[PDB]
Write a protein that binds this ligand. Sequence first.
Ligand SMILES: O=C(O)[C@@H]1C[C@@H](O)CN1
Ligand SMILES: O=C(O)[C@@H]1C[C@@H](O)CN1
Lengths: 263, 263
Amino acid sequence: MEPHDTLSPAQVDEYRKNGFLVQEHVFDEEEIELLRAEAAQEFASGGERVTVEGIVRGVHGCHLYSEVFGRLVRSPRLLPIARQLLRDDVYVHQFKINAKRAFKGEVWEWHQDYTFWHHEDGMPAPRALSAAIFLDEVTEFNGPLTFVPGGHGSGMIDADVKGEGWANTLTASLKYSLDVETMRGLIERNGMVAPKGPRGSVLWFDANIPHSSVPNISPFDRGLVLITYNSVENKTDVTRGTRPEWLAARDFTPLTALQATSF
Amino acid sequence: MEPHDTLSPAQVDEYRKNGFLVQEHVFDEEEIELLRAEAAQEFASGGERVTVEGIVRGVHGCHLYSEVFGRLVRSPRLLPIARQLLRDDVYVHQFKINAKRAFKGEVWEWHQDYTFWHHEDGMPAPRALSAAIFLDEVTEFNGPLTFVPGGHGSGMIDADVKGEGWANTLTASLKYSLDVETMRGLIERNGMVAPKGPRGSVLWFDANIPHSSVPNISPFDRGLVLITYNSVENKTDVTRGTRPEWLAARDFTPLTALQATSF
Ligand SMILES: O=C(O)[C@@H]1C[C@@H](O)CN1
Ligand SMILES: O=C(O)[C@@H]1C[C@@H](O)CN1
């Protein structure tokens, strides 16, 4: 293992100011292909953990079931940056894989992840973030995650609620959405940015940053592996929890990094 | 009237190479507001010439019914550039207004306009182009027209056909679409570009350039006034024509430019 990676002070400042940051080329092509193959296995075998638009859209919880993905979350490319940004030991709250195949895709309601994790899972504060690993180059045209830079600084934003239980936390129509109303001011104030990057990049983003994405009109897929790390001190209150382990983790053991072994 | 506008030789070369070109800030804000108000009147009063996604999407043929838009097509900002690019006297084949309101919008099938005009209207060759006037700033996020640069150089491309008559020439689901198949090669060869620009710009594009667009996830509208000029020598063969005058013109009188008057 290479000496644990960390973000420069400029990178940190950029992440805190904007609410997101791209590191290019974290993983190589061969690494990405391993992850892609495992994702395909999880989409085939994940059963109730899968979501379909038909056509698989998402699979959840894979680090609990896949040895590859259980290792990935402890990678020296990821874990030390999460600990650096959250200023704590960390654990995985949620793991999901979101594909947008060429010429497919949904419009995804503008939203803040933390609203779901607070209300559905009992997350007490937004001291969490996600790492989105680019299984394919992310361009203007294959439905990139789209943010309001600085939009997290509001904290959590009162939001239109739709549905019962949690079924529609993972779908087209999201349970907690930001209406056109609130969005206009956000965007007049702050603008919109769809970070781009090559295959193998990682996109870090704040649990409270507003985000959205459109359809992929490209002939190329947009597969993302999203790992949500949470602060151990910020562990969710499992007595207010309403979802299964494969959406909202309950094992709060602090993660340690993978070490090099001969196998 | 200012001495008729024309494109520089670099601008021409760029248009011919890419198949599109943006001129920024052709019209001013006050001019644009006049056009916006007239568009709103046409959407209210156009009847069978209107198209709805509900919610108005398009209105067609307005230069035949609106004095403002009848003048616009003869504007010294537009007509002389069309004559320059088509190397002929010109007339209006088609006029349409396409709005994408904030948070609304459709995915539009990749396609070439000339395929419709050849097969539905009897246009003998692709010696035509469109001028898209930006009634609002066009950004990454409000569903900009998206092209394959150089994609017109194929000429017309064999295309999936769907429907009877012409009803679905103006809709979500288009009669002549380019499938994922053909699109992949195009885009590997040539890439994708979504020209941007401020309100009052004009986007010129070739009758044969492939194009597509996605939904507007912005809190801002994307209104476009699209004037399709055709070469008089390239006049459509009215004996193969299948659509009304307000989609496919039959008066081939060469246009002359507006001159300054006291009223
Ligand atoms: O339900 C959740 O937990 C996640 C948060 C957002 O990505 C939407 N779905
Ligand atoms: O039907 C037509 O004539 C136009 C050409 C494309 O803009 C699609 N509709």
